[PDB]
Structure formats: structure tokens, C-alpha cells
Symmetry: D2
Subunit: 115 residues, 4 copies
């Protein structure tokens, strides 16, 4: 599994469950084409998004929408979207893990490249 | 000033100077229309992007070009930019300050409204 | 002002007002000696904690009392405070700005030196 | 395993390996007594810190020192220490996971309480 995504909720302190996450790859003319997508499991992770064969170097974007989310402590009209754009490079390690921590008016994201 | 941006560098514990920032607004046909852009000052701040009249209601995307910043420092960054999409002025005018904290493999963005 | 503090509330997208902050300095016998304290303003800033002469070289601990802040808003916080320990003025005087971003179950702290 | 600790490196984008992490519990007179400690594994995690029987409600502190760390991209005289103080409550979920993301002049931490 070359690309994994982990989503956490910063106000409830739990995994972000049943959250839709989309992954796009940049096209030649600079369009974003759909690459892979799914919904986070009960541990806030999303596995089997792609395979080693399909995941080649290029520019990818991981998008997470927090609109539906939060009827928890803080709802807001902000409608924040996490947008993580990065370049997959065959030079560094093989496996990537993208983590996103969500709040109503903020979000942080990190990348852990192992193996 | 209704829309300000502030960038901090968590590697050298200083403001992020000369960073390029682009702001887009979502068009009726789902495309992203250029709205405003500029670069941060020596204090890491970017003011005067737009005015009260130009900043209408809508879905905006703020892109901070972190890759160029880290490479010009010798670092090997993971991300192309630090981005965040949000809805603004949905209930009349408000003042926004988007603040970003940067590291080679991580970043966060926060909004302070009015 | 050589030591400033700035706190932001990521839940309501505003500065964190009236937040208590304590600063300690590590004593020769490893105990933590009270150094300065105060509360953030309506802008979420705390200035005038100390002066250039009082702020000597040493290991300081800045504690932001987040629990009291979240409970007074009705939230159920995880942490007692947001804390961070660091070494200061080890190479002559410098100006520090510690900025903190708060959420009920998470927080970050960043330092901007001179 | 009631209390787990995960440490990540924000400049190298990898798990923080062989990092010493200490856990203290607050004593009656407000002293901090040693509770548990160890060194992060090759995946940046630390397991088997304590047991359900030993981990009762109270105020705990998880400390991580970044002094030795970083002969990686950015070394600094800052000598930052992550200090995560929290109260364990038997009301919320049973398992706690404390995550810490380190940088030379900054750090963020989150808590994920499950089950």
C-alpha cells in the first residue's frame, strides 16, 4: 500500500469516521484528474486507495471536505477544505502516509514517508 | 484591509519572507478565477491584496508557494504549496487573517475572522 | 518588549481572549522559579511580561492555561495547559514571540526569535 | 495498552527513532513523580508503557526532549521540549494515543481517545 490517508478530529479527539477523501493527479494541461477516493474507516484510515503499479511519480492532491462534518461542539459557516498537494518522487522512500488534523477554522497536515 | 496573510517558518523560527501567495475565487462554472496575489514582507505579512468592494461573497482558495521557499533555503520539501479553501462574507462583510506555519514535511493554516 | 505571547482559538476562529499565562525559569537546583505572568488582551496578545534587564539567559517554561479557557466556553478539553520549554538568550539578547494555536484535543506552539 | 505515544519528525518526514520520552504523574503535594518511560521504536511508537491496573485517573505529563535530535537540516540552540500535560478521566474512552510532531522552533500535539 503506497499511499495511505489518516484523518483526525481535533475537537472531539477521535478518528474522523465515514469522511470522504479524494485524490487527484495533475494532468499535462494542468487539469486535475480523478485518481482514487473512498471513505475513512472507523479508525479514520483509508487503505487500498491505489497500487504500486498505478502510483507513479507526478503531482497529487488530497482533498478533504469538512462541510457535512461537525454537529459536534463547533459548527461554522467557514466550510474549510484540507487541500494537500505534493509531488511523488521515486527517489525517497516507497510508502507515503498523509495525516490531516481538522478543526472548524484550522487544519494541519503531515507526511510520513517510510521504507 | 479585509484579507491578510501571515507566514511563519518553524525551521529557523522567523517570519517567512518573500513568499508568493495566490488567491482564487470559485467561478459559476467550477473553474478557479485569479483574484489577487502578492509576496510576504520582511515581517512575513502580506497586506493590501484586495478592497472591501472587490472582496465579495464566495469560495476562495489561498495558495502559499512553499516549495520555492524551501528550495531557496536548500531544504527538500514534500509539498508543492500550503493550501486552504473556505467560504467568505456569506453573512455580510468580515475581515480575514490567514496565518500559516511551515516545516519541510508539514504545515498548518488558521483563519481569524473579524 | 523581549518576550511576547499570542494565542489563537481554532474553534471560533478568533484570538484567545483573557487567557492566563505563566512563565517560569529553571533554578540551579532544578526547581522552577516564577518569572512572570499575565493574561492575553482582546487581540489575544500579552506584552510587557518582563524587561531587557530581567530577561537573563536560561531555560524558561511558558504555560498557557487552556483548561480554564475551554471550560468557560462550555467545551470539554483534554489538556491542562499548552506548554513549551526552551533555552533563551544563550548568545546575547534576543526578542521572543511565542504563538499558540488552540483546539480542545490539540495545540501547537511556535517561537519567533528576533 | 491504555497509553501509547507516537513521535514524528516534521523536517525529515519520518518517525522519530530512538527518542527518549518520559511520563510523570502529579503527586499530592504537586510534585511530579516518575510513572513510565522508554525509547521510541523504529516506527516512532512506544508500547507497553503501562498497564490498565497501573493507569488510574490523575494528571499526567509526557515530556520529549529534542536536544540530541537533529543533525538533520536544521539544528538550533532553542533546545525545545514537548510538554504534554493532561488529566486521565475514566468517563471518556479507555485507550489514549498521544502524538507529537517536532520541529526546531515548534511542536504540535494531539490526543486520540478510542474504545
Amino acid at each position: 500500500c503506497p499511499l495511505m490517508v489518516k484523518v483526525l478530529d481535533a475537537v472531539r479527539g477521535s478518528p474522523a469516521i465515514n469522511v470522504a477523501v479524494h485524490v487527484f493527479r495533475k494532468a499535462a494541461d494542468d487539469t486535475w484528474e480523478p485518481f482514487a477516493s473512498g471513505k475513512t474507516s472507523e479508525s479514520g484510515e483509508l487503505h487500498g486507495l491505489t497500487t504500486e503499479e498505478e502510483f507513479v511519480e507526478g503531482i497529487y492532491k488530497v482533498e478533504i471536505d469538512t462541510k457535512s462534518y461537525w454537529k459536534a461542539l463547533g459548527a461554522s459557516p467557514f466550510h474549510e477544505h484540507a487541500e494537500v498537494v505534493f509531488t511523488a518522487n521515486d527517489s525517497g522512500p516507497r510508502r507515503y502516509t498523509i495525516a490531516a488534523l481538522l478543526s472548524p477554522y484550522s487544519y494541519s497536515t503531515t507526511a510520513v514517508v517510510t521504507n
